[PDB]
Copies of this chain bind each other. A is one copy, B any other.
Amino acid sequence: QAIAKMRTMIEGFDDISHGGLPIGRSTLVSGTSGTGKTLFSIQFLYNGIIEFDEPGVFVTFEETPQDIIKNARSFGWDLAKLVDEGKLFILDASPDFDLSALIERINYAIQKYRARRVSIDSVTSVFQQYDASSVVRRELFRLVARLKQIGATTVMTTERIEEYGPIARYGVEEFVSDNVVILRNVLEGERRRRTLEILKLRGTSHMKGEYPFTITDHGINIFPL
């Protein structure tokens, strides 16, 4: 029957989303630079491992595994240990148009590590890396559709350049994803404020509009209203 959700245990998120992220579906998490997209994607995996012993695969296209690990120490998280224990796997897909080969490497890692959670950060970059903007819808669809067939629950980050403009970069990514989460970092009166919005969850309910959040030493904390 109806879609089930997995608790993210990210403070306030499971309230906003009426239970967590839809299982076996993809969630687009989109935001301007420094909005906390990587943090959200890491905290998803980390909580999966710590709260439910669900292994996670982190796919990176630019940042090195070592820097992902190093930056997570800002939040007191020891990702190197989780890697050593085989609970976390960071797949380095950085450079040295068709996503089929990558998709197969990712599927391979999911199977190998028995992963229930996957984060991909950021899919925007791989198309720009290889001047492939003409084929974004088709290739993103290929990736999302395969992850659905595998039954992976996935967070995929993407980039945007305006807080109240396009949801992502090419005006197609939100339509391909099952779920859309928008992180904003709005500048008004010389000051910033962070908000999180669940725009869409296909096949299930969620709270609407923007909710304040903070990034602290404990990662993301969202305040439902």
Contact = CB atoms under 8 A, between A and B. Distances in A.
A205 interface: yes
B161 A203 contact: no
B141 A129 contact: yes
A214 to B, nearest CB: 10
Interface residues of A, number: 62
B129 A33 contact: no
A171 to B, nearest CB: 5
- 5 A-B pairs with least C-beta separation: A34-B200, A71-B203, A33-B174, A190-B210, A128-B137
Interface of A: 1-3, 32-34, 38, 62-64, 67, 70-74, 94-95, 122, 124-125, 128-131, 134-135, 137-138, 141-142, 145, 148, 159, 161, 164, 166-167, 169, 171-172, 174-176, 178, 180, 185, 187, 190-192, 195, 197, 199-200, 202-205, 208-210
